[PDB]
Amino acid sequence: EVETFAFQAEIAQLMSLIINTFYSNKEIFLRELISNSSDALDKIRYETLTDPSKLDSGKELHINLIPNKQDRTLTIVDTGIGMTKADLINNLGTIAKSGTKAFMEALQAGADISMIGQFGVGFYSAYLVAEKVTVITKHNDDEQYAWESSAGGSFTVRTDTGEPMGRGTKVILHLKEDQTEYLEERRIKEIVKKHSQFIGYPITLFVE
Numbered sequence: 247e248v249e250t251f252a253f254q255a256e257i258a259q260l261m262s263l264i265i266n267t268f269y270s271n272k273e274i275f276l277r278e279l280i281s282n283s284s285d286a287l288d289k290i291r292y293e294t295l296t297d298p299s300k301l302d303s304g305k306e307l308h309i310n311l312i313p314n315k316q317d318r319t320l321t322i323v324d325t326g327i328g329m330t331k332a333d334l335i336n337n338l339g340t341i342a343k344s345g346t347k348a349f350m351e352a353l354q355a356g357a358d359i360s361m362i363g364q365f366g367v368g369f370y371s372a373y374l375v376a377e378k379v380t381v382i383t384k385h386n387d388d389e390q391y392a393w394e395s396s397a398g399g400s401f402t403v404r405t406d407t408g409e410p411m412g413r414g415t416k417v418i419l420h421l422k423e424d425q426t427e428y429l430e431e432r433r434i435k436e437i438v439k440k441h442s443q444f445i446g447y448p449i450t451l452f453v454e
């Protein structure tokens with residue numbers, strides 16, 4: 247059923263640095279998420295170039311944004327390659343330990359946090375606005391899993407006999423009391439227009 251994993255020390259440190267460092271420009275989280283989705287869609291597209299069956303689990307490659315003012319979530323869905331359980335345990339497909347190192351040094355030499363994605367650990371910026379992050383993922387070569395954490399040095403993984411998804415990744419953000427602007431139509435379109443206007447895949451913003 248539910249396995250529990252400790253973050254490597256370095257991720258745990260990045261996460262804490264992200265949660266505590268005073269830093270106003272929290273909007274970038276959306277850009278790192280959308281850009282992760284796009285990377286993952288590149289990958290299923292690439293793979294399909296040589297094997298068309300790769301797309302049997304769905305041929306539309308797209309990114310939806312789904313706010314929910316009632317649950318206080320913002321969900322980013324994509325029809326990318328997805329991750330296996332191994333990928334979810336191994337820092338969500340990232341090279342997060344070396345990447346946290348280069349980010350740490352960079353930060354001490356005058357990066358700011360908005361530059362997190364140049365170090366390959368953009369996922370973690372989700373913790374700028376979310377108290378808890380659940381990732382659901384289905385890869386063609388594995389079953390559906392949900393990865394979850396509220397930081398604090400640990401994460402969980404479990405099989406998701408929830409809503410089958412076909413193929414993709416779904417990042418539900420459970421937003422902090424004071425970051426509900428990220429749930430407003432007006433405010434999301436603005437961030438997508440500003441940081442994510444040249445993404446090679448349709449982005450749909452759902453309405454409620």
Ligand SMILES: CCNC(=O)c1n[nH]c(-c2cc(Cl)c(O)cc2O)c1N1CCNCC1
Pocket residue numbers: 278279280282283284285286289324326327328329330333338339340369383414415417
């Ligand atoms: C090994 C093949 N799978 C993937 O690469 C993958 N599948 N889904 C994602 C993904 C990860 C995050 Cl954090 C996200 O917000 C969206 C994604 O699609 C993936 N990424 C995106 C790039 N960083 C590594 C994990």
